[PDB]
Amino acid sequence: DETVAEFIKRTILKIPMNELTTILKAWDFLSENQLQTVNFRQRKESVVQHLIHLCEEKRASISDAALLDIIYMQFHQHQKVWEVFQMSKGPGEDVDLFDMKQFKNSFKKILQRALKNVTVSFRETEENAVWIRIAWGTQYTKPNQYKPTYVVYYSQTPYAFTSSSMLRRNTPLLGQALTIASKHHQIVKMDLRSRYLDSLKAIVFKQYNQTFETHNMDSRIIHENIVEKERVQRITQETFGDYPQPQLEFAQYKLETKFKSSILAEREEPLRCLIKFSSPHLLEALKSLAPAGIADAPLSPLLTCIPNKRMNYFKIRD
Amino acid sequence: SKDLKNQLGHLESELSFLSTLTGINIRNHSKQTEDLTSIRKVLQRHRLSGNCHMVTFQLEFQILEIQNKERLSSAVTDLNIIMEPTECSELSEFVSRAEERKDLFMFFRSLHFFVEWFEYRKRTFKHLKEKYPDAVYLSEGPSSCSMGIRSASRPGFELVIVWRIQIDEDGKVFPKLDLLTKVPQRALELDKNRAIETAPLSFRTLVGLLGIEAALESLIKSLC
Amino acid sequence: KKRQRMIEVQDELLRLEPQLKQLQTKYDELKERKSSLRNAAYFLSNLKQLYQ
Amino acid sequence: SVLRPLDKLPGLNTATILLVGTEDALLQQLADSMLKEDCASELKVHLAKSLPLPSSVNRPRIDLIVFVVNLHSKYSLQNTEESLRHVDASFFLGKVCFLATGAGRESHCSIHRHTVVKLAHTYQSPLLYCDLEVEGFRATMAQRLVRVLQICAGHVPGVSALNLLSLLRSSE
Amino acid sequence: HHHSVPVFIPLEEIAAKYLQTNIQHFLFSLCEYLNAYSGRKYQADRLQSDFAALLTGPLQRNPLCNLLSFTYKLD
């Protein structure tokens, strides 16, 4: 089919040149003896032209193209912004005996009956995770391969991470599929979004702090205000800890508080504001504000409570 | 040197707090090592003593630490624990099984649970004895197996209640409560309803219904 | 339009199941509690009468 | 407490300078630049964020005070206006100097320098310009400031601080 | 404050049930729960590492290691 050929060509064109061999080796759809026939010294365009011919000579379905897409995706995994789900269960419910095949079948069937045409793939990852790629369609349209959805589900745990691309239309359906396939009664969306899936994972599983205590110069210059400097240093160290901070890039606050400062004393309505913080490495810029003299010694708790509360978007009322 | 005394006091306090927290009071410990190398192989021989509430123990073992380039694997090759000769034979046979299995952590866990249930049994017997001196005959002792309930005026009618602690093959501990009836025949031909032959099952249902001490209290009140 | 109805009725059933599951269990120990209580009362009365 | 010019007797061949500002790194760099060279006198540099200072008894007498203002920050200007109210009027007679930083990069500037010009004129004192982030420019300002300090301490015969007032007076 | 026990082990239930009272029994229950898991995982991994000859395909296993399924042929 020409569609699968175009899909494979586009996916390969996305791949960087230096790491193309590792992706091809992991995919291993093409025979190993075929690989050395192609030469990677020449132009990228020539290499993709040859690879299309080799993969077309053999039978190539859409499933292996989807598998190549999953393999390419889990290498980069910072091209999308991720969101977190949390599932809950009843008090008297017993611990389940997870079975991969049953999970795959249930997640298949729910989508297959609710919609009509839909493609879902699986790639059982090491370290107890599952990668899923879903192409959305309905009774009267073929699946759209340009806009897939990726979800990472950690078995035996209540958490699943999903990519926000086109999931807005079919969010309740995917929620039902996830909560049925894994035998959970309810599901809610955690208000914590980021582009670093590993930082999200470390925060959500709260394993960013791994230190456990076990037993097994030019004297002419005089620095006044020295006690204040040492006190602010101590307060900053206590508040921000001593571990390496997880890497975020954004934080948002919504304010609905009254103005209290002669000026707007008679006003009885809140002052409506929305503010955002953006940085290449947030929580590291914030740590350095007080020693530099731009903030007071203890920062407000709204800023020092990101990883502990697993919160990224806030709302404040009077 | 005063600060050094301060560290000594702090360490003594920490040791006491930890020992009372876990429930294991550890005595002196000696380690003797021999290096037997071919990838490096090192062997160690250990010796330590201690006690846990009533029970006391002293044990000697040795571990072989097979150091290599990518793993540090240590296996307890030889274990040996010796007990003070009490009459608690079930603890001794559990000692034998654990020695065969060569596991140290499981031994400590099972010993804790065993002595813990033993303390419950002893305290319950003592409390219920001091509650009713007139209807309890503690024939063998509070720290012993069985119990005797009888009337002072007449010794003909008496029921015996047995409390036993059992250690399973896997290692976990669980008790069991049964009873026996020392009843003369004259009472048997006396009453026709005769439900005392069903006493085991009914008693177990009663004790599971609302607790152990409650069932014993109800029975002793009924007997009186 | 029908797809949404399917989704919401599925939510309905998924929420309803735990309640029945809990209620059946509760009745199950309640009845046994009553029966065992009556048996214990009968046995204690009989033994007290026999000893008296 | 109010700082006083002639509270304590002078030391033997010693001069002291006080630098007041919000940016601590700039103050440290300036102090190092002042102290690196060799001079006939003995120099001491004190660093403070604002006035009044924390109380102490061992403090030697202060000979010259420099107020450094960042033109990229309103906070520094407010801090200096607050600090200016805790020094007695006798101390402005040739013993106070204003230093302004950041006029090189005009795009960053939050303060119009008419403001610092008018402030310096109001308090009858000189106004200096330097970009303290550049080391080559900072090196020469350190030496100029050392020479002014030596004049103020009385280490050059025939010239005092009150005389230095007329030398540095601006026509308008 | 913080810990290193894995997520799929149920610490929350044990903590809620035994944390406020009888802390040492809470510790011993956690010890049992962790030892059992380590033992089961060790059995599965050692079988996979050693006797790859007899097994036809990789065995099925889950993170908590409470459901094993494999097809073995002996010669």
Curated annotation (Swiss-Prot), chain B:
Residues of the signal peptide: none
One Gene Ontology term from the biological process aspect of the record: chromosome segregation
Keyword Ion transport carried by entry: no
Record localization: Nucleus; Chromosome, Centromere
Keyword set includes Repeat: no
Keywords: Centromere, Chromosome, Coiled coil, Nucleus, Phosphoprotein
Superkingdom of source: Eukaryota
GO cellular component: cytosol; inner kinetochore; nucleolus; nucleoplasm; nucleus
Protein's job: Component of the CENPA-CAD (nucleosome distal) complex, a complex recruited to centromeres which is involved in assembly of kinetochore proteins, mitotic progression and chromosome segregation. May be involved in incorporation of newly synthesized CENPA into centromeres via its interaction with the CENPA-NAC complex.
Family: Belongs to the CENP-P/CTF19 family.
Subunit structure: Component of the CENPA-CAD complex, composed of CENPI, CENPK, CENPL, CENPO, CENPP, CENPQ, CENPR and CENPS. The CENPA-CAD complex interacts with the CENPA-NAC complex, at least composed of CENPA, CENPC, CENPH, CENPM, CENPN, CENPT and CENPU.
Protein name: Centromere protein P
Provenance organism: Homo sapiens (Human)
Included stretch of the parent chain: 53 to 283 of 288
From Swiss-Prot, chain C:
Species, as recorded: Homo sapiens (Human)
Compartment(s) of residence: Cytoplasm; Nucleus; Chromosome, Centromere, Kinetochore
Protein name listed in UniProt: Centromere protein U
Any coiled-coil regions, as ranges: 1-42
Assembly mode: Component of the CENPA-NAC complex, at least composed of CENPA, CENPC, CENPH, CENPM, CENPN, CENPT and CENPU. The CENPA-NAC complex interacts with the CENPA-CAD complex, composed of CENPI, CENPK, CENPL, CENPO, CENPP, CENPQ, CENPR and CENPS. Interacts with MLF1. Interacts with PLK1. (Microbial infection) Interacts with the N-terminal domain of Kaposi's sarcoma-associated herpesvirus latent nuclear antigen (LNA).
Similarity field: Belongs to the CENP-U/AME1 family.
Tissue expression pattern: Expressed at high levels in the testis, fetal liver, thymus, bone marrow and at lower levels in the lymph nodes, placenta, colon and spleen. Present in all cell lines examined, including B-cells, T-cells, epithelial cells and fibroblast cells. Expressed at high levels in glioblastoma cell lines.
Span within the parent record: 315 to 366 of 418
Swiss-Prot record, chain D:
UniProt keyword list: Centromere, Chromosome, Cytoplasm, Kinetochore, Nucleus
KW Protein transport (keyword) present: no
Expressing tissues: Isoform 3 is highly expressed in spleen, and intermediately in heart, prostate and ovary. Isoform 3 is highly expressed in resting CD19 B-cells and B-lineage chronic lymphocytic leukemia (B-CLL) cells and weakly expressed in activated B-cells. Isoform 1 is selectively expressed in activated CD19 cells and weakly in resting CD19 B-cells.
One of the GO BP terms on file: chromosome segregation
This protein's record includes keyword Metal-binding: no
Localization (cell): Nucleus; Cytoplasm; Chromosome, Centromere, Kinetochore
Major localization class: nucleus
Alphabetized InterPro entries for the sequence: Centromere_Cenp-M (IPR020987), P-loop_NTPase (IPR027417)
Xref: Gene3D superfamilies: P-loop containing nucleotide triphosphate hydrolases
Record's GO cellular component terms: cytosol; inner kinetochore; nucleoplasm; nucleus
Quaternary assembly: Component of the CENPA-NAC complex, at least composed of CENPA, CENPC, CENPH, CENPM, CENPN, CENPT and CENPU. The CENPA-NAC complex interacts with the CENPA-CAD complex, composed of CENPI, CENPK, CENPL, CENPO, CENPP, CENPQ, CENPR and CENPS.
Physiological role: Component of the CENPA-NAC (nucleosome-associated) complex, a complex that plays a central role in assembly of kinetochore proteins, mitotic progression and chromosome segregation. The CENPA-NAC complex recruits the CENPA-CAD (nucleosome distal) complex and may be involved in incorporation of newly synthesized CENPA into centromeres.
Name of this chain's protein: Centromere protein M
From Swiss-Prot, chain E:
Compartments it resides in: Nucleus; Chromosome, Centromere; Chromosome, Centromere, Kinetochore
Biological function: Component of the CENPA-CAD (nucleosome distal) complex, a complex recruited to centromeres which is involved in assembly of kinetochore proteins, mitotic progression and chromosome segregation. May be involved in incorporation of newly synthesized CENPA into centromeres via its interaction with the CENPA-NAC complex. Modulates the kinetochore-bound levels of NDC80 complex.
Quaternary structure note: Component of the CENPA-CAD complex, composed of CENPI, CENPK, CENPL, CENPO, CENPP, CENPQ, CENPR and CENPS. The CENPA-CAD complex interacts with the CENPA-NAC complex, at least composed of CENPA, CENPC, CENPH, CENPM, CENPN, CENPT and CENPU.
Family as reported in the entry's similarity comment: Belongs to the CENP-O/MCM21 family.
Protein name as annotated: Centromere protein O
Organism the protein comes from: Homo sapiens
Gene field: CENPO
